[PDB]
Amino acid sequence: MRKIDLCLSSEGSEVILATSSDEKHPPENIIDGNPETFWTTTGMFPQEFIICFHKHVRIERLVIQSYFVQTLKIEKSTSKEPVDFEQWIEKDLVHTEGQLQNEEIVAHGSATYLRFIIVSAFDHFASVHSVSAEGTVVSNLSS
């Protein structure tokens, strides 16, 4: 009942602008959702990337399951291009050591692009395992 996984490529949302992008640790896993894979930095602080919904989606929550993250600068865009952004929710994350912290972020906004800027982490390696936006698609791009 509403709140579908808007962040996946299965929903037509891909990733772009990956500062640190591994070819054997593929960021494509982020929008895939296989537990055996995750995106970890090769040592690029800060580490930023954009998620292209390619569509107008209504975000009600951000579910972020990651490790090591300290400063998570969440910036949003509702433009048509990889430009014109607004600082949405820059939040600090609690150092999770062996703890799966599923972050229920109650953030209400419409977006087409999201730029996750992980400025710093408690560890010099930061890994995102799963991220999803809980909401619904408002406008299909080609329809």
Swiss-Prot record:
GO terms for cellular component: centrosome; ciliary tip; cilium; intraciliary transport particle B. Ca(2+) binds at residues 29, 32, 37. Keywords: Calcium, Cell projection, Cilium, Differentiation, Metal-binding, Protein transport, Spermatogenesis, Stress response, Transport. The keyword DNA repair does not apply. One of its GO terms (molecular function) is metal ion binding. Detected in placenta. It is found in: Cell projection, Cilium. The keyword Transport applies. It holds the Pfam family F5_F8_type_C. Belongs to the IFT25 family. Component of the IFT complex B, at least composed of IFT20, IFT22, IFT25, IFT27, IFT46, IFT52, TRAF3IP1/IFT54, IFT57, IFT74, IFT80, IFT81, and IFT88. Interacts with IFT27. Interacts with IFT88. Component of the IFT complex B required for sonic hedgehog/SHH signaling. May mediate transport of SHH components: required for the export of SMO and PTCH1 receptors out of the cilium and the accumulation of GLI2 at the ciliary tip in response to activation of the SHH pathway, suggesting it is involved in the dynamic transport of SHH signaling molecules within the cilium. Not required for ciliary assembly. Its role in intraflagellar transport is mainly seen in tissues rich in ciliated cells such as kidney and testis. Essential for male fertility, spermiogenesis and sperm flagella formation. This is Intraflagellar transport protein 25 homolog. The gene is IFT25.
